[PDB]
Amino acid sequence: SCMVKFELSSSKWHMTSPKPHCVNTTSDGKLKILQSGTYLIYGQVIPVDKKYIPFVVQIYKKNDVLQTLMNDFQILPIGGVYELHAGDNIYLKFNSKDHIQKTNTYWGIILMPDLPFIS
Amino acid sequence: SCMVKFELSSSKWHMTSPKPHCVNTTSDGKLKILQSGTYLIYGQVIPVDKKYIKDNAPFVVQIYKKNDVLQTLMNDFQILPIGGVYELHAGDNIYLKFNSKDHIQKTNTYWGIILMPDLPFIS
């Protein structure tokens, strides 16, 4: 049972244990997958109000883009269900760091349980 | 340990157990929350390509909790992750509403919830 959540406001990860078995976390908000499996990558990137300012966020897996999101400076949930392999680095890239409200912005992963049963 | 995933293509829920303790599910893809707690609501809504949409109705998805709007999402007909971490209470219902059902590609569109473990350790 393995879940981590990075809070951009404090730059700290909140975690299910001191040394989650499924992932290593970095203070720069990156992570490295230790256990191959099905993961839910998740998070909300909250933009600042436009009066202060394209709003773009990418999720990377190693050196390749896993997901690209864009909108007109509105709340942006990120992620989805992915098959990840031990060794994979997962991290976010922003178009402009200044677009991002740190308060309330967060992201993370959870190793998923199997879902064998149907409706 | 309690997670459910609704696949719009089959209209079936895939679940951690035959009868998840934390929710009841409906065959039209709605949830009733049975256990108060911290949940991660998740999913991806895949829109039909904008080139095929011949008017100017926007692509909008909302998640409702009872009769409160939990979140409203819009983009220019691109893949749309949804959800986040929310405190839900016993008795809450959760469901989605789309601005137009015909904007939605059934294949690969899915959503669901997972009862979250406590995250007491900070580093």
Side-chain angles (χ1 to χ4, degrees), chain B residues 35-65 67-96:
Chain B
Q35 180 169 344
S36 291
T38 306
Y39 290 82
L40 174 56
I41 299 171
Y42 67 98
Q44 291 194 337
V45 179
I46 308 300
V48 174
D49 192 296
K50 200 195 181 145
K51 81 175 82 135
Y52 301 124
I53 300 308
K54 299 318 174 54
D55 61 48
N56 319 240
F59 174 52
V60 184
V61 179
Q62 282 176 319
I63 299 174
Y64 277 80
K65 181 182 68 165
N67 298 120
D68 293 334
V69 174
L70 250 200
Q71 76 176 197
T72 298
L73 306 184
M74 166 173 62
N75 78 16
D76 192 22
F77 295 80
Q78 299 167 162
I79 290 166
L80 183 72
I82 75 182
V85 174
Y86 289 95
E87 252 54 43
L88 307 171
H89 291 88
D92 288 351
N93 339 252
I94 302 277
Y95 55 94
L96 280 48

Side-chain angles (χ1 to χ4, degrees), chain A residues 42-62 64-67:
Chain A
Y42 71 97
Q44 287 184 351
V45 181
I46 302 314
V48 295
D49 284 345
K50 294 181 83 168
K51 73 188 177 173
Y52 298 113
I53 307 286
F55 186 51
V56 177
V57 179
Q58 292 181 305
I59 302 170
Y60 278 80
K61 175 173 76 171
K62 296 183 155 141
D64 290 314
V65 190
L66 190 64
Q67 185 175 85

Side-chain angles (χ1 to χ4, degrees), chain A residues 40-62 64-92 94-114:
Chain A
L40 176 53
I41 301 181
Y42 71 97
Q44 287 184 351
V45 181
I46 302 314
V48 295
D49 284 345
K50 294 181 83 168
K51 73 188 177 173
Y52 298 113
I53 307 286
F55 186 51
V56 177
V57 179
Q58 292 181 305
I59 302 170
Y60 278 80
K61 175 173 76 171
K62 296 183 155 141
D64 290 314
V65 190
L66 190 64
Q67 185 175 85
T68 304
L69 307 181
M70 323 186 19
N71 69 20
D72 183 30
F73 295 82
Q74 309 168 164
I75 186 183
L76 198 53
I78 73 170
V81 178
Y82 297 87
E83 293 302 331
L84 299 183
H85 286 95
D88 288 347
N89 309 282
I90 300 304
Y91 55 98
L92 276 44
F94 304 113
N95 185 33
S96 174
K97 278 162 180 162
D98 282 348
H99 291 169
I100 307 317
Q101 189 206 261
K102 304 207 155 194
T103 310
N104 299 334
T105 289
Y106 64 87
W107 57 84
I109 62 171
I110 180 168
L111 178 62
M112 282 158 53
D114 296 304

